[PDB]
Design a protein around this ligand. Structure first.
Ligand SMILES: [Mg+2]
Lengths: 438, 368, 259, 249
């Protein structure tokens, strides 16, 4: 069948007038000022906006017009995007958008795949259908959210999917305009043919559209008749995908505009585990972690609404996904306080690991402290950017909300009306997470 | 088929069990403080009892190489044994390992000394450890074994070490509000001095309580882990009955020689066990007449009444027993005349319970 | 004329799921979602599965609503270990669930009295084992409480219902947060720049496909329209027994009978 | 028509449900921390053993059960333990084991069940009187085998004391009786005080069906008046089973 990105509807978006449709590319950049990205998966929204931003950088490299504020996208991009109809095609003889055969369910990471189990979460590979729109917006998560496949299967342009810090706005034109910071290098984006390796530091549009995995896909003698896994009832759907591995060559000095990088060069991953081990305590979404490398290295303090995406993954297991729209105006920064804020997980685990009495090092401590940490984190984190900018919200007054749940936990823990039990309850109350300078 | 054994023991002022700080163990049962004796202490004291010595055949040691080296007059094998053990899966002198004593002694000695290998020697040592199930104390208390996966070899495997416990000892719950008492002791300096003081002023806490002690035998499990035989099973059941009625936890008995004996035995045969903890959800407060033992037995018999009529199981009735010595402490003082076989001995109840177990006698079985 | 029924959501535990749950971390939101009370609605009619997608979700998808927080319950996490092939092999699957504990709510449902009249005889008598949005979370209060009536505005309906109190010396939230939908006062109205998007709008049901919606924060202090209710109902037993009766009229006459 | 097995269950000191770090699980209700067993744990404990199997249409049309988290009638009281595994072979010093710490809690619980009319008839299996037979098994099979847990070291299989079965069709848990956690006064039991709280809640809500009440040898009456708040102060094993059997059909 014939498919095209510029013609057929692919992105689910709400309207500022209040009606969510499915529209194609031409309507969403020709209107571009009455809509917002509306995806159930948050990093999926991030991938689609990344695709739009790379498209905007391509249009800026061709026609050379910047996006002015409070005004929709310039009309000089449709006579650059209208003449190429062989470009964004999926099926047929020609260049495609972005032996070994795996299930198509592993492309969309939320849907379980052929694990080492006889059963999955009520899914089964090569059986459940999936529509064109979700396949296509799952291919946008290849260059930016590709994980390790057992240390023999390579990752994307980063060894692990890094934390992504990014500016959010009420408008799609506002989203594109607020994230327009370019660099002098051009690159070679994947919607061209075979990219030229040339020298290192390949550029920006090359790394925005990097291909860690080849995708070919295959279509049998027609297909299905209704949806079985997506939810939107569509026509005859696809069956399976094809995948291979490109080993990313060594070197390739490349810094991500939205990525958060450790000082040693490795990518910074989200730090959420469902196990409270000897060194971790499950708290919440870790918006606190990726603040050192984005408020000191790239972008820094700036005006505009800030958005944070965390997709934790250990080796080849996808464990969660979330989002956080945080507040930011750009009123400078304190290095040390934001350094403490850059890892509260160590402080929270150190507070959890304290036992009722004693000095053993790997005793589990108080396990009901770990059961009140998530609500306290949710209560602290609603004005997370207010805590970030250090106006009137600090570490020393953020733990004041911890007191009530801790009083009632201490009521459970010391159920005696004695002087001694009241004293241990009060000493239990004084517990709060102490900051750490790493 | 599973056997319940219940006791109601009043004890002299004693400290049979302590926590890290030295206090007697306490539990919040029914909203009030109840004195507690740990189940593991009772299991250990019954293990080390003076009548289990014909059946005490389990060892829980980390010094396995020391056990090998003891039974070797001139053939020093203690570094070779140590490295065999260190690549067995234990990583150090090791962790705690449960096995039969004589079996590991002789046949680990013969399988270790021969200079035939070092890798397969560790593999067969591990197999000898894993097959060591010919001991009924392991069959009663239970044992798993988890070696490390780091300090090992990829060619060394471990068989399934599944052994289920055939005994569920409950913690001895006091039949009243716990009154923890503080003992103040000094340590006399034998030689005199200027100060005329104590060598060590110390802290000890003791508790005098009437403990509801509760055990339970899974006889079917006791023979599904002790292979097809039943002679050893009946001998172990009789040995436990004698030991539990005869031995006490070896806590501070040198300072509190509380060797008092269980003033109550309740053996009831059914397929759905019960603790009479709810017999004493109401704390037992004594009256001017009678004593704490009689009031506790009275509340227990009231509970036995409304769980033998309100919770009646007449498909499998109670074979409820006693140890009322010449009927000193009767159960049914007002209504509960359901004690079918109230006796006043201990060997008689041992023989009776092994009789409903099967065609056995007390003296013939006591030879395995 | 009664255009609104005030759903009463209250139990020991409850959870209406948020969007950030595909993997083993399953989470909730600090409001009963639209398809967290419409699922209760569909169960209350006694149907489910794929029947709710047609003529039951679009039958009220044109209808605005508002929710009220009587007390903000705290978020609790429960350990949950799925055994997989154990009651495949014995590999135990792992998870963690989010629970909203001790939170009471009040949802509005406004616009017309025929559907509310059909709905009033749907909360108490017709059931399909209704719960608080989670299958293992029981509603501790009669859901058919707070009888319907005419109150034309969203705030008037949401504030014209008495507020309960469990014991006498109990802390009470003086500000009641209000979650309201978007009202298009004129065609072409754009949403205010504080209205967060919530993704609770199903267009099908099984498997879940969703639409987003606009949610406007709103506030309510007690006193102007909402107020505390009568409590009574002594939660203190302390077994009864009379004492100290010399004579009312029936001791003089009753002493002589056995004399 | 709906079956509400409101059940009280005291427990001798033992840990039954364990979290990541081994504590008894907890819930939040009434402005206090109360002990909790998970509904999945007790629901699987209702399965996975043959004494109840004497039922695959009821815990799988999906399944037919609403089992609530075991809300304690009082505040949670988690205790801690301290075990030492002995060396038993004489070394140069004493003590060898893991020297770890365990932890336990004794609590009196409450739960609520729900089996509707069509939720039991369309359950069917193969009969129409099965929609009474399986329920009749359930009303005392729910109080047949305490789950599982660390029973080999903390032996606790305390049978329940006071059991409610209601035929009210409006699904309401009586957890609001335990809004105030149950305190202890010397003249009454903890279970008796909890049952008085349940009775005091029962005399309410009827102002704005019947009460089928179970007390073994009626030691616990639902109200100390001749105007009984259940009017069915009886109960003996399968008498209640057969009475529900001919209440349903
Ligand atoms: Mg789709």
């Amino acid at each position: 069948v014939m498919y095209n990105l510029l013609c057929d509807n692919w992105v689910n978006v709400v309207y500022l007038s209040g009606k969510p449709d499915r529209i194609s590319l031409v309507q969403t950049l020709k209107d571009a000022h009455c809509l917002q990205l509306a995806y159930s998966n948050p990093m999926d929204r991030f991938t689609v906006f990344r695709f739009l931003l790379a498209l905007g950088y391509w249009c800026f490299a061709n026609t050379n017009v910047e996006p002015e504020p409070d005004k929709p996208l310039p009309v000089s991009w449709i006579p650059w995007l209208e003449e190429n109809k062989e470009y964004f095609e999926l099926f047929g003889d020609g260049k495609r958008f972005f032996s070994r055969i795996r299930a198509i369910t592993d492309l969309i990471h939320e849907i379980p795949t052929a694990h080492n189990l006889c059963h999955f979460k009520h899914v089964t590979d090569y059986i459940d259908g999936l529509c064109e729109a979700c396949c296509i917006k799952g291919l946008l998560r290849l260059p930016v959210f590709t994980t390790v496949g057992g240390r023999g299967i390579g990752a994307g342009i980063n060894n692990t999917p890094p934390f992504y810090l990014l500016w959010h706005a009420n408008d799609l034109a506002g989203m594109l305009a607020q994230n327009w910071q370019p660099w002098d290098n051009m690159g070679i984006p994947a919607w061209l043919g075979s990219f030229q390796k040339e020298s290192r530091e390949v550029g920006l549009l090359a790394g925005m559209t990097w291909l860690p995995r080849k995708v070919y896909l295959h279509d049998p003698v027609p297909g299905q008749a209704a949806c079985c896994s997506c939810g939107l009832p569509s026509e005859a759907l696809v069956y399976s995908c094809s995948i291979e591995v490109e080993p990313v060559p060594k070197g390739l000095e490349w810094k991500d505009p939205h990525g958060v990088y450790t000082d040693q060069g490795k990518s910074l991953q989200s730090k959420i585990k469902l196990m409270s081990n000897d060194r971790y305590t499950f708290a919440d979404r870790d918006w606190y972690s990726p603040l050192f490398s984005y408020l000191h290295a790239e972008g820094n303090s700036r005006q505009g609404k800030l958005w944070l995406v965390g997709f934790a993954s250990d080796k080849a297991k996808s464990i969660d996904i979330w989002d956080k729209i945080i507040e930011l105006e750009g009123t400078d920064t304190n290095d040390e306080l934001l350094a403490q804020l850059a890892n509260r997980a160590t402080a929270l685990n150190a507070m959890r690991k304290k036992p009722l009495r004693g000095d053993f090092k790997k005793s589990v401590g108080t396990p009901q402290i770990a059961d009140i940490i998530p609500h306290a984190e949710n209560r602290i984190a609603i004005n997370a950017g207010k805590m970030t900018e250090n106006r009137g919200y600090s570490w020393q007054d953020a733990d004041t909300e911890y007191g009530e749940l801790l009083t009632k936990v201490a009521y459970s823990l010391e159920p005696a009306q004695t002087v001694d039990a009241r004293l241990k309850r009060g000493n239990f109350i004084s517990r709060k997470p102490w900051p750490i300078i790493p | 088929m599973l056997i319940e054994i219940h006791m109601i023991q009043n004890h002299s002022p004693a400290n049979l069990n302590r926590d890290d700080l030295g206090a007697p163990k306490t539990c919040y049962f029914g909203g009030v403080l109840r004195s507690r004796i740990s189940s593991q202490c009772i299991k250990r004291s019954i293990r080390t009892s003076n009548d289990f010595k014909a059946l005490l055949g389990g060892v829980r040691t980390r010094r396995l190489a020391d056990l090998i080296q003891q039974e070797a007059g001139e053939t020093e094998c203690w570094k070779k044994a140590q490295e065999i053990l260190n690549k067995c899966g234990f990583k150090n002198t090791k962790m705690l390992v449960f096995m039969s004593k004589d079996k590991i002694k002789d046949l680990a000695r013969i399988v270790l000394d021969n200079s035939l290998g070092l890798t397969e020697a560790a593999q067969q040592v591990a197999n000898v450890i894993a097959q060591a199930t010919l001991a009924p104390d392991i069959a009663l208390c239970g044992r798993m074994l988890e070696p490390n996966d780091k300090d090992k070899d990829k060619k060394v495997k471990w068989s399934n070490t599944t052994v289920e416990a055939a005994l569920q000892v409950a913690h001895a719950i006091s039949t009243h509000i716990a009154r923890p008492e503080i003992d103040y002791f000094v340590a006399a300096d034998d030689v005199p001095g200027e100060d005329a003081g104590a060598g060590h002023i110390g802290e000890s806490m003791f508790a005098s309580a009437c403990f509801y002690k509760y055990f339970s035998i899974d006889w079917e499990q006791l023979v599904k882990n002790l292979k097809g035989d039943t002679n050893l099973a009946a001998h172990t059941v009789g040995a436990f009955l004698l030991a539990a009625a005869k031995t006490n936890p070896s806590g501070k008995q040198n300072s509190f020689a509380a060797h008092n004996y269980p003033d109550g035995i309740l053996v009831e045969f059914k397929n759905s066990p019960i603790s009479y903890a709810n017999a004493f959800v109401r704390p037992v407060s004594v009256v001017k007449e009678s004593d704490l033992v009689e009031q506790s037995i009275g509340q227990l018999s009231n509970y036995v009444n409304d769980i033998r009529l309100g919770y009646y199981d007449e498909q499998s009735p109670v074979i409820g027993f006693w140890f009322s010595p010449n009927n000193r402490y009767p159960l049914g003082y007002k209504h509960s005349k359901l004690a079918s076989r109230n006796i006043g001995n201990l060997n008689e109840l041992v023989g009776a319970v092994l009789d409903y177990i099967g065609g056995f006698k007390w003296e013939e079985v006591q030879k395995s | 004329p009664p255009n609104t029924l005030f759903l009463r959501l209250e139990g020991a535990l409850q959870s209406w799921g948020s969007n950030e749950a595909k993997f083993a971390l399953r989470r909730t939101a600090d409001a009963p979602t639209k398809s967290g009370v419409l699922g209760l609605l569909c169960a209350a009619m006694g149907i489910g599965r794929a029947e709710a997608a047609d003529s039951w979700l679009p039958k009220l998808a044109n209808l605005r609503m508002g929710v009220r927080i009587d007390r903000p319950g705290i978020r609790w996490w429960d350990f949950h270990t799925v055994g997989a092939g154990q009651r495949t092999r014995a590999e135990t699957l792992l998870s963690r669930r989010e629970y909203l504990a001790d939170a009471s709510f009040l949802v509005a449902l406004q616009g017309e009295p025929e559907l509310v009249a059909k709905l009033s005889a749907a909360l108490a008598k017709p059931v399909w084992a209704i719960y608080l949005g989670r299958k293992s979370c029981p509603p501790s209060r009669p859901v058919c409480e707070h009888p319907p009536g005419f109150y034309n505005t969203l705030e008037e309906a949401l504030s014209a219902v008495p507020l309960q109190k469990r014991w006498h010396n109990e802390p009470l939230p003086q500000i009641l947060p209000c979650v309201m939908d978007w009202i298009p006062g004129y065609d072409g109205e754009h949403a205010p720049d504080d209205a967060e998007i919530h993704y609770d709008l199903p267009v099908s049901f099984q498997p879940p496909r969703h639409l987003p919606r606009f949610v406007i924060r709103r506030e309510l202090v007690v006193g102007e329209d909402v107020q505390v209710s009568r409590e009574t109902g002594t939660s203190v037993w302390r077994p009864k027994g009379t004492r100290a009766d010399y004579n009312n009229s029936e001791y003089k006459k009753v002493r002589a009978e056995r004399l």
